Design a protein around this ligand. Sequence first.
Ligand SMILES: Nc1ncnc2c1ncn2[C@@H]1O[C@H](COP(=O)(O)OP(=O)(O)O)[C@@H](O)[C@H]1O
Lengths: 49, 49
Amino acid sequence: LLERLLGEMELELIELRRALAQTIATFKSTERQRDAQQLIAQRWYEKAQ
Amino acid sequence: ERKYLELKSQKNLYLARLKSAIAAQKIEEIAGNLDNASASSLFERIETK
Ligand SMILES: Nc1ncnc2c1ncn2[C@@H]1O[C@H](COP(=O)(O)OP(=O)(O)O)[C@@H](O)[C@H]1O
């Protein structure tokens, strides 16, 4: 069992590693998306100047 | 016979308009707008990748 159990454990860990990366993508993606909106608002403010 | 021609002289005109708009719809959906940030635009899907 010991050999088989660890093999399953190692396989699971990389799956966790892969999944966490996808979380970072959205965290970065929305942040980049957020900057876009304020830039548009700046254009109107600059135009309103 | 006189009435016959007045139809044919217009049929080619309608087809041209139909081909113009149908193609335009095909182009626009592939616009790949950068602002979507949802994978609807294939470009932003690449950026997520
Ligand atoms: N001024 C704009 N013009 C066009 N698209 C915009 C504008 N502002 C925001 N968007 C984008 O339009 C997208 C529409 O969302 P979504 O439903 O995912 O795309 P689709 O319309 O292709 O289904 C949003 O994700 C957003 O990023």
